[PDB]
A paper describes a structure:
Hydroxyproline is the key recognition element of small molecules targeting the von Hippel-Lindau (VHL) E3 ligase, which are of interest as probes of hypoxia signaling and ligands for PROTAC conjugation. The modified Hyp residue is crucial also for the recognition of the hypoxia inducible factor 1 alpha subunit (HIF-1α), the natural substrate of VHL. Herein we report the synthesis of VHL ligands bearing thioamide substitutions at the central hydroxyproline moiety, and characterize their binding by fluorescence polarization, isothermal titration calorimetry, X-ray crystallography and molecular modeling. The new structures revealed that the noncovalent interaction network between the compounds and VHL residues was fully conserved and consistent with those observed with previous inhibitors.
Numbering used by the authors:
A (entry chain B): 16 to 47, 58 to 112
B (entry chain C): 62 to 202
C (entry chain A): 1 to 104
The structure:
């Protein structure tokens, strides 16, 4: 498949399917093959990437949907990232 | 506008909670007022008596987060074919990451301290604008 | 059955899926397409254990109920710099801050 690179503020390079990243309108704008995020640390951006997989697997599905887990320690930062990324 | 039709035609239904939440069934009565019904614990079922044309929706009993019933917002009991009950499969939706984050932040921070959180003011309003059945009845209408 | 993985080396992390019945070698071919290094220059790991090319991901403990979309299983990756293989090194993610008083 076609992949894209999402880079966290601390230098972790997350490689995900283009389709998965294009779920975020912000990322689509930033691409129109790499994107640097100056404010999103790796412990938040990894969870963002896991959300893409979750959403694509469970959107339009009969199989029972599990809760998307978010630890209390990362919830505030993840909220801010989700607001920026619009997802 | 959104109200149950006073049909008086019985319809037997199974409320099946296939979610990790405690479920609050809400019946929209003949004047459109939401009536709360007893809760269903996670993974549990109740065989209940309702009627054809009646409107139901389903929420998290603690937080009022929206839930889906047969992949959609509203459930309306249909005709029982072969005497068998209609199944109401209550599930989690695929929440946005933003709304899921808001749920977790609401579960940890008490309403008084949303202002004290170091975030943009619009998120403070997103937190305070918590899920509410009256708002979604205006949305669905 | 689909299994959902994070393939990780140094500060690199690939999110992808594969079949439970697919092989370790076939996963190296996925890594090859993404990072442009052939299978012979790759070592794949479950924790400290080196994985054999012929074995299925299911045989190596990557099953659909442990390697989930919301919580994927980690596969370690190490490259051969010309002569010899580097040691397995996975840089940890950043640490979360303290919970603020309001959340604490
Ligand atoms: C004349 C008329 O239709 N009156 C309404 C108030 C009636 S009798 N309703 C409205 C809905 O169609 C359901 C029906 C009703 O109240 N049935 C009794 C009932 C009692 C408990 C429960 C529930 S919901 C979760 N757990 C239980 C035990 C469901 C139905």
């Amino acid at each position: 498949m076609m992949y894209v690179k999402l880079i966290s503020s601390d230098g972790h390079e997350f490689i995900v399917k283009r389709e998965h990243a294009l779920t975020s309108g912000t990322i689509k704008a930033m691409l129109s093959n790499e994107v640097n995020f100056r404010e999103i640390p790796s412990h938040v951006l990894s969870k963002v990437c896991m959300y893409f997989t979750y959403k694509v697997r469970y959107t339009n599905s009969s199989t029972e949907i599990p809760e998307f887990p978010i630890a209390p320690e990362i919830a505030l930062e993840l909220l801010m990232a989700a607001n920026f990324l619009d997802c | 506008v959104l109200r149950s039709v006073n049909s008086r035609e019985p319809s037997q239904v199974i409320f099946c909670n296939r979610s990790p939440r405690v479920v609050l069934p809400v019946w929209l009565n003949f004047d459109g007022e939401p009536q709360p019904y007893p809760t269903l614990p996670p993974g549990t079922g109740r065989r209940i008596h309702s009627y054809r044309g009646h409107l139901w929706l389903f929420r998290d009993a603690g937080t009022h987060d929206g839930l889906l019933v047969n992949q959609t917002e509203l459930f309306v009991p249909s005709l029982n074919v072969d005497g068998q009950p209609i199944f109401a499969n209550i599930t989690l939706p695929v929440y946005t990451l933003k709304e899921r984050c808001l749920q977790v932040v609401r579960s940890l921070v008490k309403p008084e301290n949303y202002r004290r959180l170091d975030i943009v003011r619009s998120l403070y309003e997103d937190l305070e604008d918590h899920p509410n059945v009256q708002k979604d009845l205006e949305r669905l209408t | 059955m689909d299994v959902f993985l994070m393939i990780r080396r140094h500060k690199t992390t690939i999110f992808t899926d594969a079949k439970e019945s697919s092989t370790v070698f076939e996963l190296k071919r996925i890594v090859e397409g993404i990072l442009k290094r052939p299978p012979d220059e790759q070592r794949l790991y479950k924790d400290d254990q080196l994985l054999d090319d012929g074995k299925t991901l299911g045989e190596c403990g990557f099953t659909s109920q442990t390697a989930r979309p919301q919580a994927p299983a980690t596969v370690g990756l190490a490259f051969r710099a010309d002569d010899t293989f580097e040691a397995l090194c996975i840089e940890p993610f950043s640490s979360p801050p303290e919970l603020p008083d309001v959340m604490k």
